[PDB]
Design a protein around this ligand. Structure first.
Ligand SMILES: COc1ncc(-c2ccc3ncnc(-c4cccc(C(=O)N5CCN(C(C)=O)CC5)c4)c3c2)cc1C#N
Length: 785
């Protein structure tokens, strides 16, 4: 009786009824559901038994940065009284907890410090400066506000959150766009490479050189209906999920336009799609087992020598695995068995090398499982960093039950932050028919393993439902009345009991540690841009100035490129900080949540260069005079430096990623001096050269006409930042390679990925690449008036 309600909620949450899965009567979809539910309920079981410090690690993972005086305000749970302490930046949380315990009435290890009005906590053997909240409070100049939450209070949160040897050569039987003759071109693929010659049909509008023993485990039959005028395409795995070779006829529901990367599952639109009927022949015959395979196991000459020293490749150079995998003959079963035998004794590879193995160039199930075993060593911070890519790779998968789905679902049920973003990446693509079944099932399994978080996500989904309804009203009204009239009409709609409830008391889909408490309707409005986005302000009494946070709701545009660009800039910032370089970056949150729908984090105390220049004796002084008002006296020098660093950081970021169409309207400055970029519509030269605006150069130069001292410090930052990224060049190339799965119009072919190779100058020597950058930087200076 209670299971009916839970299933009803899952259906509403995932944006797909659970009845649709059962109606398919597909054994693959049924076996995934039954197996994955047990795996998820086991995770929920192990979670309700975890200790209070272990639960805190699940629900509120620590936000850490990749001696000095500090005034901290410590509070207690269920008390209005607060006390200010003189603690060091080197001091641990346990020492600060001892001070609060010492502080007036009549063990510190039984407590955890909560960040006021936020789902963030301060615990563990880490100095105060290492935590992202205390670190940010130092730079902002704001006093950190903490709460002494006892073990009994944390434990009560866990309790409230309760739950085959045949040499026979391999070998067509509606709703087609008429004109011309229709021909079916077919090929046998194993990832990118072809197993044999692409045999096509006979050339009027409703109408292989490989042995069966040689066909690999992960082989695909790729069809295409031509007229040259393309009509449709269709893919199929020759072996099923149960490991047996496909026998008999099959009706293939074609996708509208050989495409190897495309899905192996059929078109859901059975009514309005072209169907191709194929005759797959009688041989039961299942693929040989691991025991049977192990019992059997660059230029043309360069690849021949790599295959000869295959045994030496395992011992001498184990990181060369990928080069050997692209040289192995997948069209010859004897060669596959010898390679697979080497893969079983192959030692575990580092995270960087495993990220490469997850590409479409390595479609083998065993080679795939090797990459997951090597990716198990990823930290929850590293896994979150590459989460977008690992979700896109699920589109390359052949079967519903895969090692990547197990790993992502296993880590998501072990970390609430990881499970939060895995939910949104899956939910935001339920409009796309090719992934809607897979993504739907993965989200259902997660819900079976997290009934409390399911209701937490339901509240987020309800807020976003009211936001679309309010935005459509804004869209219609903006084309009919004056802005103040529309804004008041929006406020009235928001002030409704249905809206006030849904829009208040929730977790930010952008940051689960950010609590969207009370909605500040009076301060809410909409942006003048084409899609009329919504400016939604919030406030929390318990958090004070920390709860004064905002969100931007935008419907009508694809937010995937922006999310990807910002994440890359955030990876740039992390790698820079790792080499001691803090370029004061502002990687604001950007998370798509639906069909051309998403959320963008509000950077408070910021304005656009355009609004600052439009209002000083000279226009060149505007940007600087603004920083003089927002930073008077001694504070200006710190702000010119914050500007200088962020300008250097954003100059390299836009150059390396090839972001163009940068103007005064899509560049912002924070009152701290921190410059940042918004609206990343175009990237990877869709060649964008280095850019130096004289308006920013005037600020770097402290107002002076010829300040070589300050300007050249800035050249140094750009150079340092560029050389740091160059070292991790492969990280960006490997991540962008996996992102080809997403189907982003500016990231589809090899030419887009080649842009990153040219911008980072991967081939050239560090000395030679620094000079090439020095020529482009100087050309950017000459370009400034
Ligand atoms: C995916 O595209 C995007 N990318 C980045 C941003 C983005 C992100 C953070 C931001 N943080 C702070 N300000 C902005 C920003 C930039 C330009 C104009 C305005 C604006 O319309 N205002 C009227 C309301 N208002 C007040 C006080 O009433 C504030 C000014 C706001 C921000 C814009 C947005 C989008 C979109 N759509």
């Amino acid at each position: 009786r209670v299971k009916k309600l839970i299933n009803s909620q899952i259906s509403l949450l995932i944006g797909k009824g659970l009845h649709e899965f059962d109606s398919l009567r597909d054994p693959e979809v049924n076996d995934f559901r039954t197996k994955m539910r047990q795996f998820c309920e086991e995770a929920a079981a192990h979670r309700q038994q975890l200790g209070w410090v272990e639960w805190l690690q699940y629900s509120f993972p620590l936000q850490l940065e990749p001696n000095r005086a500090l005034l901290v305000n410590v509070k207690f749970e269920g008390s209005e009284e607060s006390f200010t302490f003189q603690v060091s930046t080197k001091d641990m949380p346990l020492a600060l907890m001892a001070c609060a315990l010492r502080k007036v009435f009549r063990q510190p290890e039984e407590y955890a410090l909560q960040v006021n009005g936020r789902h963030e906590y301060l615990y563990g053997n880490y100095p105060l400066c290492h935590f992202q909240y205390i670190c940010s409070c130092l730079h902002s100049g704001l006093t950190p506000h903490l709460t002494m939450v006892h073990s009994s209070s944390i434990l009560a949160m866990r309790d409230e959150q309760s739950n085959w040897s045949l040499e026979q050569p391999f070998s067509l039987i509606r709703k087609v766009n008429a004109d011309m003759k229709l021909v079916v071109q077919a090929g046998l693929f194993h990832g990118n490479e072809m197993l044999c010659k692409t045999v096509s049909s006979s050339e009027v509008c409703e109408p292989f050189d490989i042995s069966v023993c040689d066909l690999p485990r992960m082989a695909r039959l790729c069809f295409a209906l031509y007229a040259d005028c393309p009509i449709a395409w269709a893919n199929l795995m020759l072996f099923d999920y149960k490991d047996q070779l496909k026998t008999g006829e099959r009706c293939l529901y074609m996708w509208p336009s050989l495409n190897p990367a495309g899905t192996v599952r059929g078109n859901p639109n059975t009514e309005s799609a072209a169907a191709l009927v194929i005759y797959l022949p009688e041989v039961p015959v299942y693929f040989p087992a691991l025991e049977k395979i192990l019992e059997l196991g660059l230029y043309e000459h360069e690849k021949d020598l790599v295959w000869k020293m295959r045994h030496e490749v395992q011992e001498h150079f184990p990181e060369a695995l990928a080069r050997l995998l692209l040289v192995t003959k997948w069209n010859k079963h004897e060669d596959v068995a010898q390679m697979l035998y080497l893969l079983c004794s192959w030692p575990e590879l580092p995270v960087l090398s495993a990220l490469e193995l997850l590409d479409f160039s390595f479609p083998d199930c065993y080679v795939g499982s090797f990459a997951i075993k090597s990716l198990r060593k990823l930290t929850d911070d590293e896994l979150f960093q590459y989460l977008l890519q690992l979700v896109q790779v699920l589109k390359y998968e052949s079967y519903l039950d895969c090692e990547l789905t197990k790993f992502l679902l296993g880590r998501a049920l072990a970390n609430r932050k990881i499970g939060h973003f895995l939910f949104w990446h899956l939910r935001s693509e339920m409009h796309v028919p090719s992934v809607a079944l897979r993504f739907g099932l993965i989200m259902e399994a997660y819900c079976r393993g997290s009934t409390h978080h399911m209701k937490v996500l339901m509240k987020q989904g309800e807020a976003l439902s009211k936001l679309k309804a309010l935005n459509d009203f804004v869209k219609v009204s903006s084309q009919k009345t004056t802005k103040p009239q529309t804004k008041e009409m929006m406020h009235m709609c928001m002030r409704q009991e249905t809206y006030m409830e849904a829009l208040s008391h929730l977790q930010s889909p952008l940051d689960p540690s950010t609590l969207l408490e009370e909605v500040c309707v009076e301060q809410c409005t909409f942006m003048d841009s084409k899609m009329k986005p919504l400016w939604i302000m919030y406030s929390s009494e318990e958090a004070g100035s920390a709860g004064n946070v905002g969100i931007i709701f935008k419907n009508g545009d694809d937010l995937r490129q922006d999310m990807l660009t910002l994440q890359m800039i955030q990876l740039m910032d992390v790698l820079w900080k790792q080499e001691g370089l803090d370029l004061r970056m502002t990687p604001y949150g950007c998370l798509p949540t639906g069909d051309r729908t998403g959320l963008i984090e509000v950077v408070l105390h910021s304005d656009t260069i355009a609004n600052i220049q439009l209002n000083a004796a000279f226009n060149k002084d505007a940007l600087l005079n603004w920083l003089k008002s927002k930073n008077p006296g001694e504070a200006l020098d710190r702000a010119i430096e914050e500007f200088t660093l962020s300008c250097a950081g954003y100059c390299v970021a836009t150059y390396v990623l090839g972001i163009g169409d940068r103007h005064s309207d899509n560049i912002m400055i924070r009152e701290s001096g921190q410059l940042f970029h918004i609206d990343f519509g175009h990237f990877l030269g869709n060649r964008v050269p280095f850019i130096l605006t004289y308006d920013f150069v005037h600020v770097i130069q402290q107002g002076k006409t010829n300040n070589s001292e300050k300007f050249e410090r800035f050249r140094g930052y750009c150079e340092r930042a560029y050389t740091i990224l160059r070292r991790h060049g492969l990280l960006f190339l490997h991540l962008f390679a996996l992102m080809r799965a997403a189907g982003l119009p500016e990231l589809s072919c090899s030419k887009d990925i080649q842009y990153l190779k040219d911008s980072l100058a991967l081939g050239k020597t560090e000395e030679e690449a620094l000079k090439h950058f020095r020529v482009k930087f100087n050309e950017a200076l000459r370009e400034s008036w």
